[PDB]
Design a protein around this ligand. Sequence first.
Ligand SMILES: Cc1cc2nc3c(=O)[nH]c(=O)nc-3n(C[C@H](O)[C@H](O)[C@H](O)COP(=O)(O)OP(=O)(O)OC[C@H]3O[C@@H](n4cnc5c(N)ncnc54)[C@H](O)[C@@H]3O)c2cc1C
Ligand SMILES: [Cl-]
Length: 468
Amino acid sequence: TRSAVVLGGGMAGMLVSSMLARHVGSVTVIDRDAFPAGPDLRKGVPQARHAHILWSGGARIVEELLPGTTDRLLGAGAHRIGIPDGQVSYTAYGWQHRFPEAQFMIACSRALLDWTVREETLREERIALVEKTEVLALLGDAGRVTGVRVRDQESGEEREVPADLVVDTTGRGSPSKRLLAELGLPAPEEEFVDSGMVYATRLFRAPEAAATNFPLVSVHADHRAGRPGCNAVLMPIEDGRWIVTVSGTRGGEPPADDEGFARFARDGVRHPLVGELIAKAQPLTSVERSRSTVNRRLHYDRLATWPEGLVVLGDAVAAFNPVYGHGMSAAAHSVLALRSQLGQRAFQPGLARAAQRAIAVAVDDAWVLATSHDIGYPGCRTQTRDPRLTRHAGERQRVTDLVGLTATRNQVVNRAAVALNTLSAGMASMQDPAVMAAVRRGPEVPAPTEPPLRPDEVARLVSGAGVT
Ligand SMILES: Cc1cc2nc3c(=O)[nH]c(=O)nc-3n(C[C@H](O)[C@H](O)[C@H](O)COP(=O)(O)OP(=O)(O)OC[C@H]3O[C@@H](n4cnc5c(N)ncnc54)[C@H](O)[C@@H]3O)c2cc1C
Ligand SMILES: [Cl-]
């Protein structure tokens, strides 16, 4: 009984459909893209050409909604990398000492993650993916949405797909601003923090011995330095490859040419480690860039009026600067927020509004973590009324910088910091008295003076082939 229509069959759409199919009789997913029968790139998810980190907070939720996905990913060559034990990270405050595991991440191509997640979701035959289909209009009116009018691309035929609940998960390029205007809703407040960040990515074949058990390697900008923020991330993915993504805010953008890529990874960032490691590896693709890096949020939950039966989640409601790596975990948290309101309110009037509000809460930590560190860069453009980002942003940042500094050399502060940064704990968790006590206790290990690489990791950057 009852039906859902989900707009967009990407990460948020697949997760939300798996959840919804446990609460409604059927789920229909509408997408204008064509979907490959394998782990390939597709036009509807262009961001898949860049490094994607799936933090524990999101990965645990993916596993809860689609049990077995983690093992299927690992069986397909994805890597489970412990945090901080499995990462070599030059932070704004120095090298992170590699304490024992506190959290983790899953490292693989976004194409593989999407394929795996889609396959697992569609094992439920009550979920149907309708490809190559345009979304023309929401059915109903500003008081209640009752489905969607769609158009088949190949035939051109239009039909109405009924729904008790429509969920827009069409991503950063969502047409809901248009769909909701034509439904007769007021325009939502648009909030953004635009550091002008640009990505550049090349794929590499790792040295053969380093195809597994290799760390996540990141060189971070110093958000406190009045200069463009540039980063470099090297991430293992399946089939013995490394995805390397470099990034820079306004005035420090990485170049488009293959030669400038390696120079940026050496000299454009604060430490050349990633540039050093890609010099061991074989490039496989030419530089691809992306400017889809603005933190942008639409406050649908604060509209004066909202239709029954409509919810927007994922990048369609809040999108982030990807350097912090939260988007997929924010969407997963947002799916559980909808599930929470479904369990509390079933389909009574008030469901959609309460879910939209809960989704606003769900994305708030990812939103603050990204925007708090982007607002300071030279030439950052902002449109916000959030006092946390302006008036007393410095005080919020003074505490974050003290936590961030102490986390590099104190295990208890690190454990709390990585719980928050993986979206495994809430923002307030850091004000726990015991955390602030550890912060005041300060460092328990010396600051590393060199990249904290293990001998047995560096040993695997060479084959030893030309040696009798
Ligand atoms: C460069 C870059 C790097 C990133 N790195 C990370 C990372 O490390 N970690 C992380 O967690 N997140 C990362 N993200 C964010 C992540 O990609 C998104 O948060 C995530 O894909 C959001 O999922 P979604 O389902 O909301 O949208 P998407 O996954 O983009 O899916 C949107 C879907 O809607 C469909 N669609 C779009 N428009 C229409 C339309 N008009 N009609 C019908 N269908 C439509 C598309 O075909 C697609 O299937 C990164 C993003 C970028 C750009
Ligand atoms: Cl992109």
